[PDB]
Design a protein around this ligand. Sequence first.
Ligand SMILES: *[C@@H]1O[C@H](CO)[C@@H](O[C@@H]2O[C@H](CO)[C@@H](O[C@@H]3O[C@H](CO)[C@@H](O)[C@H](O)[C@@H]3O)[C@H](O)[C@H]2NC(C)=O)[C@H](O)[C@H]1NC(C)=O
Ligand code: LPE
Ligand code: CLR
Ligand code: CLR
Ligand code: CLR
Length: 998
Amino acid sequence: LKVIVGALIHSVKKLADVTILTIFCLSVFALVGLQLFKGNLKNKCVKNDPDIYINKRGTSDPLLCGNGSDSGHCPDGYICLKTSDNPDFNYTSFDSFAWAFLSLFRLMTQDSWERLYQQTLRTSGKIYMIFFVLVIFLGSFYLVNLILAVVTMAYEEQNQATWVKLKTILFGLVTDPFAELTITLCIVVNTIFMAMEHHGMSPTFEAMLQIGNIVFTIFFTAEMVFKIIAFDPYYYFQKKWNIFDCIIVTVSLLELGVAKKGSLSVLRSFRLLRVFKLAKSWPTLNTLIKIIGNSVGALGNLTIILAIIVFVFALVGKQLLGENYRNNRKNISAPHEDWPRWHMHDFFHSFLIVFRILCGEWIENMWACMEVGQKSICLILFLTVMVLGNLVVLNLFIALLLNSFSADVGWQVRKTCYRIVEHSWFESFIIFMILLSSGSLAFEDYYLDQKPTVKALLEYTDRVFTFIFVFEMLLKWVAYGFKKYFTNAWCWLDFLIVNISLISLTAKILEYSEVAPIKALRTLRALRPLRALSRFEGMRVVVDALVGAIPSIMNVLLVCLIFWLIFSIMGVNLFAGKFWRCINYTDGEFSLVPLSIVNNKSDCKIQNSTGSFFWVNVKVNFDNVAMGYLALLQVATFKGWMDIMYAAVDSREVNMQPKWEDNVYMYLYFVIFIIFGGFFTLNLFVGVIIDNFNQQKKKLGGQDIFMTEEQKKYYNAMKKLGSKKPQKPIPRPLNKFQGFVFDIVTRQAFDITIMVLICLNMITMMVETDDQSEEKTKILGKINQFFVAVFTGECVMKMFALRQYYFTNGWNVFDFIVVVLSIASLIFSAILKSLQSYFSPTLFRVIRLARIGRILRLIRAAKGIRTLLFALMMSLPALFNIGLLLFLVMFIYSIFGMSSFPHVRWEAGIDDMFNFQTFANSMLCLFQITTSAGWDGLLSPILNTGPPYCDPNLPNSNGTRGDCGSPAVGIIFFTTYIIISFLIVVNMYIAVILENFN
Ligand SMILES: *[C@@H]1O[C@H](CO)[C@@H](O[C@@H]2O[C@H](CO)[C@@H](O[C@@H]3O[C@H](CO)[C@@H](O)[C@H](O)[C@@H]3O)[C@H](O)[C@H]2NC(C)=O)[C@H](O)[C@H]1NC(C)=O
Ligand SMILES: CCCCCCCCCCCCCCCCCCOC[C@@H](O)COP(=O)(O)OCC[N+](C)(C)C
Ligand SMILES: CC(C)CCC[C@@H](C)[C@H]1CC[C@H]2[C@@H]3CC=C4C[C@@H](O)CC[C@]4(C)[C@H]3CC[C@]12C
Ligand SMILES: CC(C)CCC[C@@H](C)[C@H]1CC[C@H]2[C@@H]3CC=C4C[C@@H](O)CC[C@]4(C)[C@H]3CC[C@]12C
Ligand SMILES: CC(C)CCC[C@@H](C)[C@H]1CC[C@H]2[C@@H]3CC=C4C[C@@H](O)CC[C@]4(C)[C@H]3CC[C@]12C
């Protein structure tokens, strides 16, 4: 309505600066991509002596090539020509500016950016990960922070603007506080009783569990009867807690009366909502329930707005694409499924599509839509859903976030070592030694076997490092008292790490050097580079800030763990052991045998003529509550989410072959789990951390946290450099000719002319295209010469108009640097094109990029972009500390992975490039998952258990008998990685937000 359009106009006015920054930064990075990797994602592997392309293991699209020393290779008998198609429906390469903009929008929204990351590093070269790191940090974090801050401030400004019965009663009225404690004990034990539901529970276990359920239903019924007789029912009403318990008990007894095995497992688990009764001695659970209530209560208007928006988008998508999806389904349909797992044909699946968009995965369905129907309709619909969809969601996540959180010889002997240790020389020696030790544990990799000298040198240096660190601890002991030394947290960590190293080294010589405990002990050497958190003041202050919030993290962690236990129990009840299928694993790719041939384990055993019918289960299932937790986490991070939705919907009943969309309506379980365990237990984690820092800062004096004392004054000086200090220039300097040029320069024409010159040098290098004609190349290359000459001449006339001692007058030094860079690029291109033109052709495009300075020159004109960049400049030291810590933890887990998974089957997620064998590869993978992208894909080849998936008979990997994973450690590793990184990055968002708040 008119009110809505007026509010939108006001918001865009408030969103103008951030929108302009987004468009400009996206354009700059699009130009960088279009001038770096245009025409690289076309190197389909092809045969040589013809026109058929190999496929990547378990893939339908062709493999990709690159000639770079560190790009994707190709199998023998194949050659790497370029082909007119791009890997993913001819839509995932940025050669034209349109594709560059789209791919950089994908990188910003971090939606399936894993795919582009792997493709581009496979076709271009591993060294280009720098572009993706830079774009992820700048814009995927930066621009999201700024847009979320803008909406925050918009909301803030909106707020600113706006007798046997007598004996029974006597016995019953006790209501002693010991009765409630017994009830709570009975709830807890009942829950932990039902938390032993597993697929292969024996009949005795089933009997025991149903007996327990009967006992507890009886006990609840008896307590309800006591309560109703304790006082007359007329007063029982007006008690929400009591009526909730009444309804749940009624459902429990109704299910008990049911004699069909509790066919509705949902009803079976309806009792489990009792844990909410436990929200009386816990304040965090009460706050969570209050969050949900405000969502459904005071702030229900926004929620209904979100629901109506999603319903409208789903219905429109169906009405406009169902028939096309049905007719051309074969186009997007899997090779064997004969159908698209997602489509618009039915309201349910259109809603699921819209929900996946809101979840933040849009490109897959985007390609499907825009290769099955009109491009215009798909283009507008998917993008308009992304913007409006994720805008409304973030409005909830904050509106709820604020609503809920607005309320003697010995003396001299000791002094000897004391003054020795205090020596700055020794302090620097030790810090450098720690850094060298951290570096040393990086080349111990899968390939270290083939270089005997390197490993011998590495073990020698580790031994010497152990000895020197033992000496250092001896000096520490001598200098400081035992009590003082042991009462220090950091001293404890340095004690444990040296203990681990010493015991590992002793075990090297001693026996028992192969058992699993000692193997794990030596695996813990990856904590060795954790000694550098006290040495560095930035890391130390960050660690103190984090440890300050440990209790506030733990409270919400436990509340969320209980909520996830509830959901895992429901999931186990619903899908205990139905995630089993008979497959066709002949060589590499596999397919579910059709129901015609095999219908159940019996068939899969008798129809096994070829020997290629295996009966195996999904990697992550709902057998146990542990696997319930793991699968719930995968659905919560939105990675691996799909393989489980597929298995859940397909499964029919124990020991039966899954059928396509048998239980098509079991998507609702995952929709509900997201909506409740993913978004409502994150509005409670954020809230707690912001209410923790809001106070912790207030307590420490309100001084900016994360910044060392030394850097505090450097930041003070910088913000002092960001002040108001203008000097009036001198007219007609020196000779009148200088005055003549100066008077015209002063006018408000030179600025605008250079600016419109910089815009026409942007739109002359954006019109470039990979398949451009040679005449087009000629004209644009000459326009480039004209522009560089114009800029150099118009930069040297102003220079003369201001003598030669005006470098420090202002930002003109940047203009001088960029113009000299452009001239240098011109001359170097001229040299290479003729003199020594035999170098690699990549350098031509690398250097040709140096013309981006003429784009960076537009900053000084844009006040909003300049202010936001200044905010980044101010935040840079704190972000440097946090990034140091994050790279440190990334290093720790890099060494862990390098030691753990150097032998694994290269299933979807792990291939030759993105394995864990090399340090750089492992670093690539860990950086990938730091954003929580593709961690499921990297996890799947670790859950492999025996054939057919893995080959535990393989000669290699003596630890596991073959290239089979170890899920016990593989789940801990990735769960801890995606939790720790979330913490660090959520403290990196807080820092940026508080800096921009100043
Ligand atoms: C797995 O599913 C298949 C398909 O539903 C089941 O196949 C059917 O099983 C029944 C019972 O064994 C068979 O019935 C008998 O068939 C013989 C002839 O083969 C007939 O002489 C008997 O009077 C009786 O009708 C039925 O034929 C069979 N159908 C097919 C197509 O094979 C199978 O039993 C299931 N396995 C298990 C263990 O549940
Ligand atoms: C090495 C094992 C691997 C995992 C290590 C943990 C991961 C690294 C990050 C966490 C570091 C944990 C240790 C540092 C904790 C913060 C530091 C906690 O403060 C304790 C002392 O450092 C302070 O000095 P004192 O205790 O001697 O005197 C003050 C007395 N009060 C005030 C404490 C009572
Ligand atoms: C596997 C074995 C060797 C691990 C032993 C680790 C123990 C001894 C360490 C790990 C972390 C340590 C704590 C870290 C921080 C502090 C605060 C400070 O006031 C000293 C005591 C106290 C509370 C430490 C006590 C000892 C402690 C709990
Ligand atoms: C200066 C003229 C073009 C009018 C103003 C529009 C300018 C600023 C920009 C806006 C969007 C731009 C287009 C966006 C993308 C592409 C695809 C690329 O492969 C060739 C150039 C082309 C087609 C651009 C031409 C210039 C363009 C039209
Ligand atoms: C409303 C203002 C005036 C008060 C302060 C509120 C601050 C603390 C709020 C408003 C915006 C919030 C952010 C919104 C979204 C995200 C992204 C999420 O992945 C982690 C939490 C994080 C980074 C939030 C942290 C807390 C936050 C910065």
